[PDB]
Amino acid sequence: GDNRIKTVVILGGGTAGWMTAAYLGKALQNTVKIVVLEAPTIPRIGVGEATVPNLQRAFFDYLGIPEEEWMRECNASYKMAVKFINWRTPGEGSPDPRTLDDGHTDTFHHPFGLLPSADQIPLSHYWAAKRLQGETDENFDEACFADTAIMNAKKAPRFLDMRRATNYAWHFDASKVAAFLRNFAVTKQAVEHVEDEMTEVLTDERGFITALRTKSGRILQGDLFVDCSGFRGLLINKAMEEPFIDMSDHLLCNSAVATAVPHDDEKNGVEPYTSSIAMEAGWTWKIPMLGRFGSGHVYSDHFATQDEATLAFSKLWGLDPDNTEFNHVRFRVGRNRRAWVRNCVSVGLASCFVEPLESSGIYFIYAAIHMLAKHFPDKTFDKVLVDRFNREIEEMFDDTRDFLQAHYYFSPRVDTPFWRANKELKLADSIKDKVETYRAGLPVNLPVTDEGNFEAEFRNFWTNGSYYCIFAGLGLMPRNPLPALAYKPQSIAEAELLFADVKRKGDTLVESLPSTYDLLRQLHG
Amino acid sequence: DNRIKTVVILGGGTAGWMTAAYLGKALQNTVKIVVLEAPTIPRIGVGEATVPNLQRAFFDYLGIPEEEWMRECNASYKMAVKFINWRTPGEGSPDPRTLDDGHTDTFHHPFGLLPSADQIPLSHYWAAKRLQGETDENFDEACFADTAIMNAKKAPRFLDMRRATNYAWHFDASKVAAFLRNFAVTKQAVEHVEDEMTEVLTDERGFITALRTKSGRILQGDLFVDCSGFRGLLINKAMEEPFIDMSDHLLCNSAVATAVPHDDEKNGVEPYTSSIAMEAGWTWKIPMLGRFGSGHVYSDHFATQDEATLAFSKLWGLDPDNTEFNHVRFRVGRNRRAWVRNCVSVGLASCFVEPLESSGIYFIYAAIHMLAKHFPDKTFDKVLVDRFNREIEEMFDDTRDFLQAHYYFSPRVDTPFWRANKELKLADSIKDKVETYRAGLPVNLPVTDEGTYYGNFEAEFRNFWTNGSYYCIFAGLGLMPRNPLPALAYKPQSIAEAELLFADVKRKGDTLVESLPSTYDLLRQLHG
Numbered sequence A: 001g002d003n004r005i006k007t008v009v010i011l012g013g014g015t016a017g018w019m020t021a022a023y024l025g026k027a028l029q030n031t032v033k034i035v036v037l038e039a040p041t042i043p044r045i046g047v048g049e050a051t052v053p054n055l056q057r058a059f060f061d062y063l064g065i066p067e068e069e070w071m072r073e074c075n076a077s078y079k080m081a082v083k084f085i086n087w088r089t090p091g092e093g094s095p096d097p098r099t100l101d102d103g104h105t106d107t108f109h110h111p112f113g114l115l116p117s118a119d120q121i122p123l124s125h126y127w128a129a130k131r132l133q134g135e136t137d138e139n140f141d142e143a144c145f146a147d148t149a150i151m152n153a154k155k156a157p158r159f160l161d162m163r164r165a166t167n168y169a170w171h172f173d174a175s176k177v178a179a180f181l182r183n184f185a186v187t188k189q190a191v192e193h194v195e196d197e198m199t200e201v202l203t204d205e206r207g208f209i210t211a212l213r214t215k216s217g218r219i220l221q222g223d224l225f226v227d228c229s230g231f232r233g234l235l236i237n238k239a240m241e242e243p244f245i246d247m248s249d250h251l252l253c254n255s256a257v258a259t260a261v262p263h264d265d266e267k268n269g270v271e272p273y274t275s276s277i278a279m280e281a282g283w284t285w286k287i288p289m290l291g292r293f294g295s296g297h298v299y300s301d302h303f304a305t306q307d308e309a310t311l312a313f314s315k316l317w318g319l320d321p322d323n324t325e326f327n328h329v330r331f332r333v334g335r336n337r338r339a340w341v342r343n344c345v346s347v348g349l350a351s352c353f354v355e356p357l358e359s360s361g362i363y364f365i366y367a368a369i370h371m372l373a374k375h376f377p378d379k380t381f382d383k384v385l386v387d388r389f390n391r392e393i394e395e396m397f398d399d400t401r402d403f404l405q406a407h408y409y410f411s412p413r414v415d416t417p418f419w420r421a422n423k424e425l426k427l428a429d430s431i432k433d434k435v436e437t438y439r440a441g442l443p444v445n446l447p448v449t450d451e452g453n454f455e456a457e458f459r460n461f462w463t464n465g466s467y468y469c470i471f472a473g474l475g476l477m478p479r480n481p482l483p484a485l486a487y488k489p490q491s492i493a494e495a496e497l498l499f500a501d502v503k504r505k506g507d508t509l510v511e512s513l514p515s516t517y518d519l520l521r522q523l524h525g
Numbered sequence B: 001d002n003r004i005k006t007v008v009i010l011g012g013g014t015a016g017w018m019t020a021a022y023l024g025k026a027l028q029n030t031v032k033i034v035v036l037e038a039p040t041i042p043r044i045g046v047g048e049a050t051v052p053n054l055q056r057a058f059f060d061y062l063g064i065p066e067e068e069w070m071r072e073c074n075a076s077y078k079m080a081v082k083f084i085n086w087r088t089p090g091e092g093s094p095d096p097r098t099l100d101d102g103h104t105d106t107f108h109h110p111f112g113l114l115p116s117a118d119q120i121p122l123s124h125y126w127a128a129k130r131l132q133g134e135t136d137e138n139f140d141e142a143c144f145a146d147t148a149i150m151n152a153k154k155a156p157r158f159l160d161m162r163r164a165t166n167y168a169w170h171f172d173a174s175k176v177a178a179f180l181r182n183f184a185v186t187k188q189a190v191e192h193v194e195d196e197m198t199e200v201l202t203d204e205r206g207f208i209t210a211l212r213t214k215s216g217r218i219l220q221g222d223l224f225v226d227c228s229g230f231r232g233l234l235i236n237k238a239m240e241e242p243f244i245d246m247s248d249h250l251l252c253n254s255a256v257a258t259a260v261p262h263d264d265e266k267n268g269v270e271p272y273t274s275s276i277a278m279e280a281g282w283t284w285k286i287p288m289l290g291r292f293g294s295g296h297v298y299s300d301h302f303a304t305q306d307e308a309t310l311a312f313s314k315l316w317g318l319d320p321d322n323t324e325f326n327h328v329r330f331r332v333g334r335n336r337r338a339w340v341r342n343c344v345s346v347g348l349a350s351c352f353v354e355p356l357e358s359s360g361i362y363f364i365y366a367a368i369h370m371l372a373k374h375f376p377d378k379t380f381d382k383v384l385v386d387r388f389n390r391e392i393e394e395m396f397d398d399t400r401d402f403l404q405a406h407y408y409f410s411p412r413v414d415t416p417f418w419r420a421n422k423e424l425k426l427a428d429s430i431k432d433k434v435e436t437y438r439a440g441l442p443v444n445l446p447v448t449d450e451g452t453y454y455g456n457f458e459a460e461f462r463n464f465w466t467n468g469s470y471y472c473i474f475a476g477l478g479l480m481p482r483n484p485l486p487a488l489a490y491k492p493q494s495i496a497e498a499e500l501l502f503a504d505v506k507r508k509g510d511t512l513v514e515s516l517p518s519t520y521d522l523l524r525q526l527h528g
């Protein structure tokens, strides 16, 4: 016979909806009808969104969409790191770094370049040895990644002839990526765009969804439903009654106030990185694009009111707190008990969320979509397929939640009740174990690759290098060097050449590369 | 200077001399290394099998070329373990019985990673075709050109030594030990003390300060490696670390072995290890130039040594009185902790399973590799020790589980041995993987190419038994998924892309089965 899914209905557009539609369009090879039900788009100012480097490999390449093509259509810029500003020093927010007890600037980078090795030990470990033994005054980021010097000079990750210099991710307008993908899905993949509100969810006797009724009275029948409805979870939470697990016992931020800020890219150039600017009750992103930069103060409302937060946010950029356009979001932090129940699959905010401290939102969507295609059911909805999908989403999420918690728990700051309450939170066992490992001088989640394949990154997402960037950046160091280094003088010496190579290539590239500004100007024909 | 200054290794053989040689290179002559070994009573070379990383991870680390060590220990090539009669009842025989469905009862467990189409391994396209009647081909022959190369007994290299395929090694264990002793003493300033141990001297915390020899000499050290074999003279006896018996997971606990002269002119040489099923266990065959090692592994709760020796002798038609037999009674399991205080267990002193999937040398290499990475100073940081212990326990339990799957999913129920296998519990870890397989999903999908996998030990160690190895054993024993992977029902272009991969396997197999020398002719050239 034929027990296959025939129709898929996706509730909600935006990134989650149109990413799911486009990806399933390619994955299911036109054997399945795909419908997107999206309420017509109330226009909101492009507050900017940041990504991680596998986005082109895991998503746009699967779809056959060249990098330059999609960037041109959504005002995209380059990202070589997240730069953390004032995460160690007390007081009011400021774009400018305060000065540490030891005299150095309170800035550290989390770049995506992965670290070379000598004698199967990463350069991280040789740096740590020299720092703990007084043989260097260099920061981890400066010693270990040429990317740090390239970002300090605001240079581009590519040459004008488009040769790659370094690894990088992307800044873009979310609503314009959604628009680009809608058009691609509708014109290239026979996806049906239904512009209407949902009013009823029709369910059979055993609790499966049979169809969505729209305002216009159209009945969208389907065998499988993707909830991309955002925080409301119109299908997964409301209709299906799957509980959401709040994880404010792990992260405190639960609110943001955002906007977009015109920018003199002639004077200042463009920063090829996202900035995480510390504040009293949370932090503030800055996502440079050609002509402006998106920003949003992420805060806990148990430690600041919306007005306190809006004032503090406005003060930061020196904006008129009444006559500038603000978007105010109150978000869920956590995940559904189960991402997929019966014939309902949650993707995006409907599934899970953390604050965008390490740009995890788009990644969560393409990872979930990738796992849906791999676990794609027939009408029997085998419980093992569903359970293994749910297992992958919970491990993906908890991994990134824990990484983020490490950013708060190991901040030295104690000046406001927010920063103090961070130290009151329990750490998940998983991240206590990794702290203990790091503190003994051992690597955490050693990377295995030279490519810098989505599947390799998904199983080991936050590698040794990323733990060092955050731990060492916040001032947490191992108790001692890796003991094996005391027996390996030849390896120490081999590592000295690697540090020299980082210095040389940093200097060579800081001279030969165009500015982010000049590459963007060339790109946006 | 709080560093370890001296390392004392109790015991030689493979575990002792591999540890000595590896630490010699790893510690860059900043540390004194002593091997205390009782002088060597010669024993029959019953043969040992290995995995492919051994040349890259060990001999190449030491700068020893492949041809050099193979020539010194009568080594041959290995492209798989071949399982014979694991599905059909009756007495042991070298020759495969026939299944109810007409297939011969042989299946291969070769090396390499399976190619993919649309991020789905070739295993899954094969399974679809088999469950849907579109193929009568075995998993092994559809999915690995190596199966055809092994069927013709051809070599994994051409005579000019171009690589054709993946492979590992058969060798004489005692000759590899001898080769490495000589290398460690003459090239790495290791001190060989030929004496028995009489005393283990300890401080107030129970840390070892020195070993007394029979001659009365006192070997001081800061770190002790127990390579003493099953007796665990340091880890179990002196340190009193309990051994966890795991006969509630595997039943075999005995072996009777020997070496068998072989007409390599008539029969050629098999470039693989054979696992020949018997009534109370199984029998290895490890071909080398001129002879083959063999040993019947058995449970003594289901056969006596006589029963086992007779049955083993019957198999090859050996004279059960006038052939030389080695009789081993082994412990199966691992220490509660591999490393206690300043005592590190390696080899049989740490852990054992029967050599059903050639895990002996690998267990040694992995422990040695992890010792160098976790190498302490005199403060013996408990986190270094704990992380070492965690790696060895997970390594062992993973392979114990994989091995149990060989017995639990054998369809055989004809003897009380095969029946008792099905009375044992499966560990959770392996139940979960069976359930995943049975829904058509991959188990332990490889995440790197072959270059990375066999080039960086850390990539192999985190993914040792891949999707391919689960299919080789499950499908080989006749456990199949309930249904194909549902995603495949929506992916006709991907089905078609997989058909080209099957065609590529056929072409490579046929091209190479014609152009390659016999294992015999490559061995003849190698041992010139």
Ligand SMILES: N[C@H](Cc1c[nH]c2ccccc12)C(=O)O
Pocket: B050, B051, B052, B053, B080, B081, B109, B110, B111, B112, B357, B358, B460, B463, B464, B465, B466, B469
């Ligand atoms: N890591 C795997 C182990 C392996 C694969 N096939 C066999 C056959 C016999 C023993 C071990 C293995 C590899 O080497 O590819």
